[PDB]
Amino acid sequence: KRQSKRAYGDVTIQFYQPLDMRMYIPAGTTFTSTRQEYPQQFETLVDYYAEPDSTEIVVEVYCKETGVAGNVPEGTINTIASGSSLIRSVNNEYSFNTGTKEESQEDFKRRFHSFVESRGRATNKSVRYGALQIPDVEG
Amino acid sequence: ANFLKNLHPLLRRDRNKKDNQDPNFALIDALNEEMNQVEKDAIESKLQSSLKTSTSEYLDKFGDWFGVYRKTDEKDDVYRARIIKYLLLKRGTNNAIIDAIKDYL
Amino acid sequence: TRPHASIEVDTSGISEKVFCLIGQAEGGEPNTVYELRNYSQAKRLFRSGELLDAIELAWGSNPNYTAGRILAMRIEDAKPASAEIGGLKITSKIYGNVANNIQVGLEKNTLSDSLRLRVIFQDDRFNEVYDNIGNIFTIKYKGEEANATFSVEHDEETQKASRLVLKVGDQEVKSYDLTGGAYDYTNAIITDINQLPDFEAKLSPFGDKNLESSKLDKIENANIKDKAVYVKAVFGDLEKQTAYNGIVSFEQLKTIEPFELTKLKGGTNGEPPATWADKLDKFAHEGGYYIVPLSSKQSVHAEVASFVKERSDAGEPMRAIVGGGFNESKEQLFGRQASLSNPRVSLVANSGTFVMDDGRKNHVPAYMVAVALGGLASGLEIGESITFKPLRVSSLDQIYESIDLDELNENGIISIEFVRNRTNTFFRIVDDVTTFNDKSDPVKAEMAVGEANDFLVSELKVQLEDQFIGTRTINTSASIIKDFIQSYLGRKKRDNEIQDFPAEDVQVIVEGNEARISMTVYPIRSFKKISVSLVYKQ
Amino acid sequence: ANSGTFVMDDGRKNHVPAYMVAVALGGLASGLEIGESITFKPLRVSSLDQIYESIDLDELNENGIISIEFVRNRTNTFFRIVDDVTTFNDKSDPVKAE
Amino acid sequence: NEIQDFPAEDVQVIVEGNEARISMTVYPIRSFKKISVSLVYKQ
Amino acid sequence: RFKKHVVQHEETMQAIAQRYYGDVSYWIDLVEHNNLKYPYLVETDEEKMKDPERLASTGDTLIIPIESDLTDVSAKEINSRDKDVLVELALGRDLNITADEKYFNEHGTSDNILAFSTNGNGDLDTVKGIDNMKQQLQARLLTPRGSLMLHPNYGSDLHNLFGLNIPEQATLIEMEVLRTLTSDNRVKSANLIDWKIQGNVYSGQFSVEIKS
């Protein structure tokens, strides 16, 4: 079952030099698309605290827009609204696969019906369906 | 009918000389071309709307109306004249019946 | 100007007591104080960080009360990013590491023989391409003779167009002294070339150019009869097209040539300093009343304490609000109160969260809560107290129970109580008490009393300076000073800033070239205890 | 600059040179009360034999030459005159300039 | 209404019997030509 | 229509319905509008991280219908999923024609001034929300009263009000602008806050009360 969960994925940030302070990353921070053609935007649900000396940190970011429209190809998220001097660039190695769209109860019930009906055997209609299951079978 | 007249005054009505690519004008020009081409078809339909100049499908419609069926490989110029002659057929008199032999020779 | 209507729709919005902030941010020229009137401007001149977190919060902290004009300053020794190539040194207008991302290159178009200038700065998506740099105006020839040429001359001791010359065959036909005189503007050269029947000249179409003719470049001996030759004046176009029109400037060291796209270097925010003292002083004469330092180090709080003492003793009153750290407990606060016991400082304890209008939440240090509170203290009309007002803080790191609102408050430390009064936003401030250890004197103890004290003192100072110490004569008794002072306090009673004054109390003595007064005034205050007694009948 | 056409009261659709548009303009300017301007007033001209349009109506006016502008509707004749600038070079002083 | 307004206490006169000299300021009246009307709200 | 609100520290969902609609009883229908799972309001964000879209926590926005649309099932369904897209839909969507913002403010009350533009990729630009409302007010002000080919008595006589800059002309201009701005029913009122003169230049500003 699908419940319109907004798209999310791991994102990594890089800095010029190793840090010398526990930098703050507020919840609600916006990671704007670097590509002009992509109006998609993402927000950070929970605060993160950079380590004292770690040169790189990975955080989880959720999209603002639900549905399949929230999916983005790899190498698109490379800008941060709350920029800083220490921050160099942002990148997402893995693509956003968790984009989800919710259908109606009928669409949920129809696949179940089709699966139950498909389990029938030793009948004309079931033989016909099982022949039509393999490709290059028509009429 | 003049799509560049007759419209919202602020939509710019001739292209920007300031830079190369002007989608606004491209859209207006496409639409104006489409509806000018429509206007030209609707003016061109004057000749199709009269038996004296109807051609292709419309002349076949006229000939079906009058009952005179198009002969195979018949051009419009002779088909119109045939229709006009057949509408003014001259038959019933012995001389007229003899003179009708020209169409049977 | 062309006659037209024009209409702008303004995002420039999204009281008297001026309010001061100092902190870190990746923008702005250092040491100078700025004046800010709405953050849609401030956001252009700073970038982000604590100072702009504070400002966007300082004006939002209560729905009906907010600070007026804000004064701000960057506590950094920043330097800009720069590069050198060709005869040009490049300097960025913004000071900070952010400038290092800006890129500039010069490319060239062989067809028009003009230079393509491009700026890239992805972080604003700012990207601009200036072309047709070079080719200021054309010279052209129309006579029948053999050959026609021209030349610009540069005198070395000025590095400026000393002469412009036209020739026919092998003899000069005209001259122009372009250092200084009639031809200082290219408009005169264009007209006075066209006047000659044998010659012609035409100006480039890419809007205005019309440079001062002193900044032409040295071109010599090109055949006019063969070519409609351009005069280039490259550095004139750089000024004309990138004076007021860019994020990055140029300065001329000497020939110019194209170069690849390059990243600027040297831009540095600068490490924090040891002290704030000889930079904190700079707010003095801009007239602010409330000041807050955006840090937690106890050294900084001792310099602010000394600063406020230094100005207030001068007749230049000021008051500071301070807030240390996150999550700090009671014993640390008492240690910090004792260590910082002077009046005109008000330590604010709590830490919590705030939400800027872009949707962004925050985990908030106590000096930010002091600023949010300072926004109320400044925005309220003179003399009225912050006490029991709602503070609009979204959530708090609440440890500070009812008993602590006796112990914290009686030791002179401000706090916010969690309060379940549902009729408005929940949190409210308990009291307006100062850091000073002694309860007795309200002028020291209560911020809403010290404020009205300072303004009354200062105004009565100015009036006595006006009327008397401008020294028209000694022949104006003590008795007339008694009359003037009672006149004056009659306006303070009439206009509702003092409750009353027993006019009979005013006692005046004069000692030649000096006089002295004693008086009594009943101050206006907020209520702070309401006691009801409720009694029964029949 | 412009040369217009006027419906002359004989029924005579007269195409008319520029020095005669100057009459039509000067006549209007002369009749109004002192201190009013031809600025943004309409003229009863029928049509124009013209090059100049909105960007040219920066260029010409900025250099001190008057011209008539086409406004597509409701303003009485579709035509109003952009400015009252004079031929003097320096526009900074309003007494000389306008 | 032939002038917009004038300051009365900014007039200077000088005289030598053979010639008088005058100085005066006037604030002129002329047609509007730029109208800049701005819009704000409270969202 | 609706009112905006935010979750406060340890505020219960009962408390909101009671404060705005009077009766506490209405909270039950009010949770369906904000599409909330049982922990309808919960203090902690690391608890919102359980399943973020189906909850609200401290600092999050909420939607508050007017009482007439409280009982409508269609309003419930729409407010459940659209969330922030409410404001855009409620202010409506339109093609963006402020392509040259620097330019149209150099030749107002002249025609041919606005033009389509492109944002994103391969699609005409569009405007929504408050920007749309501004753009529409802007276009309405810069259009003469009888120049659109249908539904005339639209626009302004701003092209007609050029005069001797004496104050009566300035009050007249103020009144025309206010009429023009108050024509749209979506806007509540306008009022002037400043008018100012610079020789032959008018300047002034107007505050407009847009419905929530």
Side-chain angles (χ1 to χ4, degrees):
Chain A
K1 177 188 183 184
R2 292 180 291 189
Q3 301 177 148
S4 297
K5 289 190 167 196
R6 291 182 286 96
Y8 55 90
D10 67 322
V11 177
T12 178
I13 188 171
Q14 297 185 7
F15 322 94
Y16 292 89
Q17 285 75 31
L19 306 176
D20 192 1
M21 57 182 290
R22 298 182 61 178
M23 186 172 59
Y24 177 54
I25 300 298
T29 306
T30 309
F31 302 154
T32 58
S33 53
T34 306
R35 300 293 184 86
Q36 56 187 349
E37 53 265 63
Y38 283 100
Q40 279 75 351
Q41 289 187 356
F42 309 81
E43 303 184 349
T44 50
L45 275 290
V46 185
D47 305 84
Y48 299 91
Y49 313 123
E51 295 294 349
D53 209 78
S54 164
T55 57
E56 290 195 353
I57 186 172
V58 58
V59 304
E60 186 170 326
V61 70
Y62 288 61
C63 180
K64 295 173 66 62
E65 294 298 341
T66 194
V68 59
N71 294 86
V72 70
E74 185 269 322
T76 309
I77 317 190
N78 305 89
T79 304
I80 186 165
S82 51
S84 176
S85 292
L86 298 177
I87 291 161
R88 199 184 64 178
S89 180
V90 197
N91 195 12
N92 56 262
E93 183 61 12
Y94 200 77
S95 64
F96 286 76
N97 189 23
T98 62
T100 309
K101 185 186 180 179
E102 179 173 339
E103 296 298 331
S104 176
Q105 189 61 9
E106 191 168 327
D107 293 323
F108 185 87
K109 193 74 65 55
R110 186 171 54 267
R111 279 75 178 78
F112 176 75
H113 271 59
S114 292
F115 179 83
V116 174
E117 183 177 355
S118 297
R119 290 281 178 177
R121 307 290 166 73
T123 54
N124 295 5
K125 59 178 180 181
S126 63
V127 170
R128 178 176 161 73
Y129 180 70
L132 292 159
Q133 274 188 321
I134 290 159
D136 311 330
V137 182
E138 297 172 348
Chain B
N2 296 106
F3 195 53
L4 297 182
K5 308 179 196 169
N6 214 120
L7 180 58
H8 194 293
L10 298 179
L11 300 177
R12 193 168 308 164
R13 303 181 290 102
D14 190 5
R15 77 190 204 295
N16 286 259
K17 70 166 71 180
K18 196 164 182 178
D19 79 84
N20 186 36
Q21 298 198 343
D22 191 354
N24 173 83
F25 178 68
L27 183 61
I28 269 54
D29 194 3
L31 293 176
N32 183 50
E33 186 65 8
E34 285 304 334
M35 293 213 286
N36 187 15
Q37 159 212 233
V38 165
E39 186 181 7
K40 289 173 181 175
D41 282 9
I43 295 157
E44 192 59 22
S45 313
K46 188 160 190 295
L47 299 165
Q48 301 291 348
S49 317
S50 182
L51 176 57
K52 182 171 185 179
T53 53
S54 44
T55 54
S56 70
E57 181 66 33
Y58 300 91
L59 181 54
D60 306 8
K61 254 55 184 173
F62 276 109
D64 298 359
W65 274 112
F66 288 105
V68 187
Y69 313 99
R70 185 182 284 273
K71 191 172 175 178
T72 305
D73 298 328
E74 194 167 32
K75 58 179 186 180
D76 298 1
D77 299 6
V78 178
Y79 184 32
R80 195 184 295 89
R82 188 157 62 90
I83 292 161
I84 293 164
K85 194 169 56 176
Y86 188 85
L87 175 56
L88 308 176
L89 185 60
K90 291 177 195 176
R91 193 260 169 176
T93 307
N94 190 29
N95 59 36
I97 288 156
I98 283 160
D99 192 22
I101 296 158
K102 301 299 184 181
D103 299 343
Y104 198 64
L105 177 58
Chain C
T1 58
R2 351 288 157 63
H4 63 83
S6 63
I7 316 189
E8 291 178 314
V9 196
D10 294 341
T11 315
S12 304
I14 192 163
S15 286
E16 186 199 305
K17 291 176 285 173
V18 177
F19 181 83
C20 299
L21 289 180
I22 185 160
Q24 194 186 12
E26 298 77 16
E29 190 179 3
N31 187 277
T32 53
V33 174
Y34 299 91
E35 189 259 29
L36 307 167
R37 207 164 289 191
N38 192 275
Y39 80 80
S40 293
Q41 183 173 19
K43 201 176 190 72
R44 184 180 177 266
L45 183 55
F46 301 91
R47 274 289 159 169
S48 177
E50 287 76 4
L51 176 57
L52 200 64
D53 298 332
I55 289 158
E56 291 183 0
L57 174 66
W59 279 313
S61 197
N62 173 286
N64 217 137
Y65 310 115
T66 165
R69 296 177 295 164
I70 291 186
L71 303 179
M73 191 212 289
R74 188 198 189 159
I75 187 62
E76 290 194 328
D77 298 29
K79 302 93 177 186
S82 62
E84 289 187 9
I85 191 163
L88 305 172
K89 172 146 60 188
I90 312 181
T91 298
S92 56
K93 301 176 170 178
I94 301 185
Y95 304 87
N97 297 38
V98 167
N100 292 328
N101 294 346
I102 301 157
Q103 288 146 71
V104 174
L106 276 175
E107 292 180 29
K108 188 180 176 193
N109 178 278
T110 60
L111 303 177
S112 54
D113 205 49
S114 60
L115 284 95
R116 170 154 288 203
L117 169 55
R118 182 166 200 182
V119 183
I120 296 185
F121 177 43
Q122 291 281 26
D123 305 319
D124 284 359
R125 287 80 177 100
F126 179 104
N127 194 309
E128 302 190 354
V129 191
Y130 293 88
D131 209 321
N132 299 294
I133 294 187
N135 298 352
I136 172 166
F137 79 97
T138 54
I139 301 166
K140 204 168 186 174
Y141 178 70
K142 231 179 188 165
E144 302 296 328
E145 297 289 352
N147 303 276
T149 56
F150 71 100
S151 56
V152 173
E153 293 186 5
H154 279 194
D155 159 47
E156 295 292 347
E157 297 290 14
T158 41
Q159 303 294 321
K160 286 178 170 188
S162 46
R163 289 186 81 209
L164 186 147
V165 185
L166 303 174
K167 296 179 176 183
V168 176
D170 201 353
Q171 284 187 355
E172 295 184 19
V173 185
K174 197 151 183 177
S175 65
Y176 309 96
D177 291 57
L178 310 185
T179 37
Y183 297 108
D184 280 8
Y185 249 80
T186 313
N187 298 43
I189 296 160
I190 288 160
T191 55
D192 293 25
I193 290 162
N194 278 269
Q195 284 161 43
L196 306 177
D198 290 336
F199 281 84
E200 289 192 332
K202 312 181 182 194
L203 174 69
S204 205
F206 308 107
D208 315 14
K209 287 197 173 196
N210 287 341
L211 194 74
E212 288 183 21
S213 70
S214 51
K215 283 169 180 181
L216 295 177
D217 33 29
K218 185 167 191 295
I219 291 169
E220 323 89 305
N221 308 327
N223 184 343
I224 313 158
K225 189 175 192 183
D226 180 23
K227 284 185 183 179
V229 178
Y230 294 115
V231 189
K232 283 194 172 188
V234 291
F235 197 82
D237 278 329
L238 290 171
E239 287 209 28
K240 286 288 296 197
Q241 311 300 344
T242 72
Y244 300 115
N245 320 338
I247 292 166
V248 174
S249 62
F250 296 94
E251 295 196 61
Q252 200 189 147
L253 292 40
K254 273 69 174 186
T255 305
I256 296 155
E257 287 184 330
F259 61 100
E260 271 187 14
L261 188 68
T262 291
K263 275 175 180 185
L264 292 182
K265 284 197 172 155
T268 301
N269 278 79
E271 73 291 327
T275 170
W276 292 9
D278 77 340
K279 323 208 177 194
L280 174 54
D281 283 304
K282 296 306 306 184
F283 290 109
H285 300 295
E286 307 316 333
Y289 179 61
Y290 284 104
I291 187 171
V292 180
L294 294 171
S295 71
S296 59
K297 284 190 172 188
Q298 178 172 347
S299 313
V300 175
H301 301 157
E303 303 154 26
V304 158
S306 184
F307 170 82
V308 170
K309 183 175 181 181
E310 285 164 40
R311 319 310 320 173
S312 302
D313 299 21
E316 187 180 295
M318 290 188 64
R319 297 190 185 257
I321 327 182
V322 177
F326 310 77
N327 189 252
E328 303 209 329
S329 188
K330 298 167 62 171
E331 291 199 350
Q332 290 92 58
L333 293 167
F334 302 142
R336 290 173 82 143
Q337 180 264 46
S339 302
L340 208 73
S341 77
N342 52 269
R344 301 187 173 281
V345 170
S346 292
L347 180 58
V348 176
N350 311 129
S351 59
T353 71
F354 281 121
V355 189
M356 279 63 67
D357 207 353
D358 286 7
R360 185 169 69 118
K361 311 190 189 192
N362 223 105
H363 185 72
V364 179
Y367 60 76
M368 285 276 285
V369 179
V371 166
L373 179 54
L376 180 69
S378 45
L380 289 168
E381 173 59 304
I382 288 174
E384 166 62 336
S385 173
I386 58 189
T387 292
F388 284 178
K389 300 300 188 299
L391 265 55
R392 212 174 198 173
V393 55
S394 188
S395 172
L396 212 68
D397 191 16
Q398 166 53 352
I399 287 165
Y400 329 101
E401 246 288 328
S402 53
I403 177 166
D404 308 316
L405 296 175
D406 284 315
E407 292 186 16
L408 298 171
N409 197 84
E410 190 159 20
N411 279 268
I413 310 180
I414 293 185
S415 294
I416 308 175
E417 183 173 341
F418 184 91
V419 168
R420 206 79 199 185
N421 299 2
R422 278 184 48 262
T423 318
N424 202 346
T425 185
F426 275 134
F427 291 94
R428 62 131 174 76
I429 177 164
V430 303
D431 205 350
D432 53 60
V433 70
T434 64
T435 316
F436 191 76
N437 196 51
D438 196 321
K439 174 173 185 183
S440 46
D441 178 18
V443 183
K444 297 181 182 190
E446 302 205 322
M447 194 150 73
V449 177
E451 181 168 315
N453 186 73
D454 292 325
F455 286 123
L456 179 58
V457 159
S458 36
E459 192 188 288
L460 182 54
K461 183 176 172 178
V462 166
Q463 285 289 354
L464 294 162
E465 282 187 342
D466 297 337
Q467 179 66 4
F468 297 115
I469 296 184
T471 187
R472 190 176 171 273
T473 185
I474 192 179
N475 303 113
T476 291
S477 179
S479 177
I480 287 174
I481 281 166
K482 188 170 178 171
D483 183 294
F484 176 85
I485 284 174
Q486 281 182 352
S487 305
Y488 175 72
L489 293 181
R491 293 204 300 260
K492 292 306 196 182
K493 185 170 175 178
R494 181 180 275 233
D495 289 7
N496 204 99
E497 283 186 322
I498 64 174
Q499 186 181 309
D500 198 351
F501 72 100
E504 296 178 351
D505 191 79
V506 174
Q507 290 151 79
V508 183
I509 300 172
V510 59
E511 300 178 355
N513 303 2
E514 162 177 346
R516 211 171 299 105
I517 297 99
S518 294
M519 60 167 66
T520 296
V521 177
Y522 306 157
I524 293 183
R525 301 179 68 176
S526 77
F527 288 110
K528 288 195 173 196
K529 179 176 173 76
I530 300 176
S531 59
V532 180
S533 295
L534 195 163
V535 175
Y536 297 160
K537 302 293 174 181
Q538 70 168 286
Chain D
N2 308 114
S3 54
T5 77
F6 290 95
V7 175
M8 180 61 61
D9 285 332
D10 303 333
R12 178 153 60 93
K13 300 183 284 187
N14 199 11
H15 169 94
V16 166
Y19 60 88
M20 294 285 275
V21 173
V23 170
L25 175 53
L28 175 61
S30 57
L32 305 189
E33 178 58 19
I34 293 158
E36 173 60 306
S37 184
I38 54 172
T39 300
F40 264 70
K41 289 283 178 287
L43 288 87
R44 197 161 74 123
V45 68
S46 178
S47 186
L48 282 63
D49 179 355
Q50 50 76 240
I51 294 172
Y52 310 116
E53 295 295 345
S54 47
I55 189 166
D56 310 283
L57 292 163
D58 297 3
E59 291 198 359
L60 276 169
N61 191 58
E62 197 137 285
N63 283 274
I65 300 181
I66 285 178
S67 289
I68 292 179
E69 180 166 36
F70 181 17
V71 173
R72 219 86 182 282
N73 230 312
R74 200 66 169 197
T75 305
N76 291 25
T77 348
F78 306 165
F79 294 116
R80 56 162 171 71
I81 198 164
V82 300
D83 217 333
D84 74 324
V85 67
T86 60
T87 319
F88 181 56
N89 172 48
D90 187 4
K91 188 162 52 61
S92 48
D93 192 302
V95 182
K96 301 175 189 183
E98 290 177 40
Chain E
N1 306 277
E2 295 195 319
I3 58 175
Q4 187 211 140
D5 196 315
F6 79 96
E9 313 191 318
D10 188 6
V11 175
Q12 307 69 22
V13 190
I14 313 175
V15 65
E16 297 190 72
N18 304 349
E19 175 171 17
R21 307 194 186 89
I22 285 159
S23 301
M24 62 182 73
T25 305
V26 175
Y27 297 124
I29 181 167
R30 59 184 190 270
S31 311
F32 273 136
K33 281 189 180 176
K34 172 164 290 201
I35 301 192
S36 196
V37 41
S38 307
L39 271 60
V40 310
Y41 43 51
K42 299 295 186 178
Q43 191 81 353
Chain F
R1 235 198 81 239
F2 55 90
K3 293 181 70 69
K4 182 174 191 177
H5 178 55
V6 306
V7 179
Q8 308 183 107
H9 195 152
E10 63 165 47
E11 191 160 14
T12 69
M13 191 61 169
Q14 290 76 352
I16 298 169
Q18 197 186 225
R19 191 170 45 231
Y20 297 143
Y21 304 155
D23 297 348
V24 68
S25 188
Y26 290 125
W27 77 254
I28 63 194
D29 303 318
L30 183 54
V31 282
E32 187 178 0
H33 288 273
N34 298 262
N35 207 351
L36 297 168
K37 270 170 164 296
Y38 147 76
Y40 304 122
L41 272 55
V42 68
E43 193 267 310
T44 328
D45 282 359
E46 55 152 20
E47 174 59 21
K48 179 177 183 178
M49 200 74 139
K50 189 172 182 292
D51 49 358
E53 173 60 19
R54 301 301 309 270
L55 289 175
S57 51
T58 319
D60 302 358
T61 58
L62 286 160
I63 302 300
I64 304 297
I66 70 174
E67 302 95 295
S68 190
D69 312 308
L70 178 55
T71 63
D72 199 316
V73 302
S74 45
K76 288 172 179 193
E77 180 48 44
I78 294 289
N79 302 348
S80 295
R81 198 174 282 99
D82 289 80
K83 297 286 284 189
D84 193 63
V85 183
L86 275 172
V87 174
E88 307 301 345
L89 295 174
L91 278 65
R93 290 184 191 158
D94 194 8
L95 295 181
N96 189 14
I97 65 173
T98 51
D100 321 336
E101 190 165 47
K102 188 67 173 177
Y103 174 69
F104 72 77
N105 289 292
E106 298 283 310
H107 291 98
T109 63
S110 314
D111 296 351
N112 330 304
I113 294 306
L114 298 182
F116 297 119
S117 193
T118 296
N119 272 252
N121 187 21
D123 193 3
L124 281 68
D125 193 0
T126 170
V127 68
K128 64 180 62 172
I130 295 287
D131 302 345
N132 186 25
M133 170 53 65
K134 293 183 160 194
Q135 188 174 303
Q136 287 188 354
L137 294 166
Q138 181 51 35
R140 197 197 191 83
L141 195 153
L142 303 183
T143 303
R145 185 169 248 91
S147 55
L148 295 192
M149 289 300 320
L150 297 89
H151 31 95
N153 196 6
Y154 168 92
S156 62
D157 292 11
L158 204 67
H159 66 300
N160 187 25
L161 287 167
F162 288 114
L164 308 179
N165 86 69
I166 52 177
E168 60 192 46
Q169 197 67 31
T171 63
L172 288 171
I173 291 157
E174 187 187 332
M175 293 296 158
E176 185 69 21
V177 174
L178 290 163
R179 288 194 293 266
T180 309
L181 291 171
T182 53
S183 187
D184 199 333
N185 188 21
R186 286 168 289 170
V187 188
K188 281 174 55 187
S189 60
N191 69 268
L192 178 134
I193 288 299
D194 184 21
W195 58 257
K196 182 178 185 171
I197 292 188
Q198 285 297 260
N200 59 357
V201 180
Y202 180 103
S203 188
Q205 74 196 343
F206 297 82
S207 306
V208 302
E209 277 268 305
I210 293 163
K211 292 188 181 173
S212 60

